[PDB]
Ligand binder design. Structure first.
Ligand code: A8K
Ligand code: AX7
Length: 186
């Protein structure tokens, strides 16, 4: 991920005018839509938190958790830490913190990253009947300058377009700063 950290603008877009900052959410959403499409209920929820982090969750099958034969760490970590649509690894590299939760095969798995560095291996923390994935990320304020807060309408505009293109996927957008909400479903 050092190639991304070296020139963040080349991977994510402009890091001063808000375009890169918002692209961070859109990259996570693309992965979440792919996941939601492979499950039954097909809903994602995008939440803007009061501390200007964003979470994206889906009710799909869960990102795979098994150890990658060649890389020797969880498949979940491989995807977060290997350059491969730019990849969620870019978002991870440019987040001062990123938290994930995978619910799969009866188990809750958790992991925390800081600036793309895993703090510990993916770990089973509990049991569950549910399936799905959730990522919450705190954009790096070392990278993102001037525009550092999420504009609701920029997110809402793109999620609307996505709802028409991915017919039958339910997309919820919530802003915990002021209570605003939308539900895009074609
Ligand atoms: O609802 C979502 C939100 C983000 C993602 S991306 C991803 C998640 C975990 C992970 O270990 C690797 C990639 C997928 C589905
Ligand atoms: N503050 C800060 N910025 C970082 C960038 C890369 C790796 C670790 C880091 N800690």
């Amino acid at each position: 991920l050092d190639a991304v950290r070296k020139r963040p603008g080349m991977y994510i877009g402009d890091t001063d005018d808000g375009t890169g900052l918002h692209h961070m959410v859109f990259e996570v959403v693309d992965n979440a839509i792919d996941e939601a499409l492979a499950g039954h209920c097909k809903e994602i929820i995008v939440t803007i938190h009061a501390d200007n982090s964003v979470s994206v969750q889906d009710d799909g099958r869960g990102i795979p958790t098994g150890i990658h034969p060649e890389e020797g760490v969880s498949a979940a970590e491989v995807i977060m830490t290997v350059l491969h649509g730019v990849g969620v690894s870019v978002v991870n590299a440019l987040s001062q913190k990123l938290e994930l939760v995978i619910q799969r095969e009866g188990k809750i798995h958790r992991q925390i990253y800081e600036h793309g560095v895993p703090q510990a291996p993916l770990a089973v923390t509990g049991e569950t009947e549910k399936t799905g994935t959730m990522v919450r990320f705190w954009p790096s304020l070392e990278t993102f300058t001037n525009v550092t807060e999420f504009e609701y309408e920029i997110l809402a505009k793109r999620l609307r377009e996505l709802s028409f293109l991915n017919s039958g996927v339910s997309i919820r957008l919530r802003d915990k700063r002021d209570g605003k909400e939308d539900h895009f479903h074609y």
